[PDB]
Design a protein around this ligand. Structure first.
Ligand SMILES: COc1cc2c(cc1Nc1ncc3c(N)cc(=O)n(Cc4ccccc4C(F)(F)F)c3n1)CN(C)CC2
Length: 287
């Protein structure tokens, strides 16, 4: 991986701050030479972070190539800050969209779900796990296409890495099985299938299930043996294929939850007629 050792402002003009967090901030930028629009995610480094770890992580981003994953262009390391240059999606997230447009149509939701599963199937083929499939992390470009955003690299380096370690506290007395669960272990890639189920409900009802319930309470309720998976509120508004798509994605047992590849063969996402034009209608609603 070629982490360019220059200033990113030499090659790009920053145009607008899109969002931020403990990882850093993301800007809309324009290539001073190409004129192409790009997203520039700046991750604030820490002294104890090693240059070896970044390369490992930048190779992960470089190798990960799928049409439904936001494209990686390059990386820069300047003044103790890391900059990741990525594909730019001019319509923001689906959350940015449905907060203005309202609930999506079943056809639009199906197209989104098929596109996400295509990317999800690719990530799981590479033994990777998104971990945060949700409407706020599903990007849309002006062409009506779907791109998965990923904030994982920040959990392995920089300030987010520090804050997690700050919460775990001292690990020297910890048993090795507890250590595993702290490095995000204990589950499988099939949690992405569940999160897509809630996302479909989120796109249909403008909120995830139990959104108005306190986070702790919601956490207890899912660990109860008698928990019931959520469902769409208005049954009549949606077809049986959609209801079944929600039923099979929201399988409690991870050993019985179907894979992204199995879900790509589901009736809701395998129907002809699903294409970018469905979201082009949505982006027009916004206008
Ligand atoms: C019109 O364009 C945009 C309008 C808005 C957003 C995004 C873009 N466009 C874009 N395109 C490509 C990428 C990319 N490859 C990686 C990446 O992290 N982001 C940022 C992002 C991505 C997902 C969630 C949060 C965030 C953020 F951090 F910014 F808050 C990208 N954003 C985010 N809404 C909250 C506010 C409005």
């Amino acid at each position: 991986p070629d982490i360019f050792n220059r200033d990113p402002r030499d090659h790009y003009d920053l145009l607008q701050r899109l969002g931020g967090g403990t990882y850093g901030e993301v800007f809309k930028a324009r290539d001073k030479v190409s004129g192409d629009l790009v997203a520039l995610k700046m991750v604030k480094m820490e002294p104890d972070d090693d240059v070896s770890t970044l390369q490992k992580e930048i190779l992960i981003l470089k190798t990960c190539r799928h049409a439904n994953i936001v494209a990686y262009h390059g990386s820069y390391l300047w003044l103790q800050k890391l900059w990741i240059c990525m594909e730019f999606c001019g319509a923001g997230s689906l959350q940015d969209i449905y907060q203005v447009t309202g609930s999506l149509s079943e056809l639009q939701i199906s197209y989104v779900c098929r596109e996400v599963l295509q990317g999800l199937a690719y990530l799981h083929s590479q033994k990777k796990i998104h971990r945060d499939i949700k409407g706020a992390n599903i990007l849309i470009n002006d062409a009506g296409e779907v791109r998965l955003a990923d904030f994982g690299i920040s959990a392995q380096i920089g300030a987010e890495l520090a804050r997690r370690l700050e919460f775990i506290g001292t690990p020297y007395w910890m048993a090795p099985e507890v250590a595993a669960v702290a490095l995000k272990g204990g589950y499988n890639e099939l949690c992405d299938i569940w999160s897509l189920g809630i996302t479909a409900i989120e796109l249909a009802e403008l909120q995830p299930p139990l959104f108005d319930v306190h986070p702790l309470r919601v956490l207890f309720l899912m660990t109860k043996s008698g928990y019931q998976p959520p469902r769409l509120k208005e049954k009549g508004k949606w077809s049986a294929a959609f209801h079944n798509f929600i039923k099979v994605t929201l399988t409690k047992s991870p050993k019985k939850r179907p894979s992204a590849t199995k879900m790509l063969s589901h009736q809701l996402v395998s129907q002809p007629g699903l294409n970018r034009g469905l979201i082009l209608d949505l982006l027009d609603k916004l206008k």
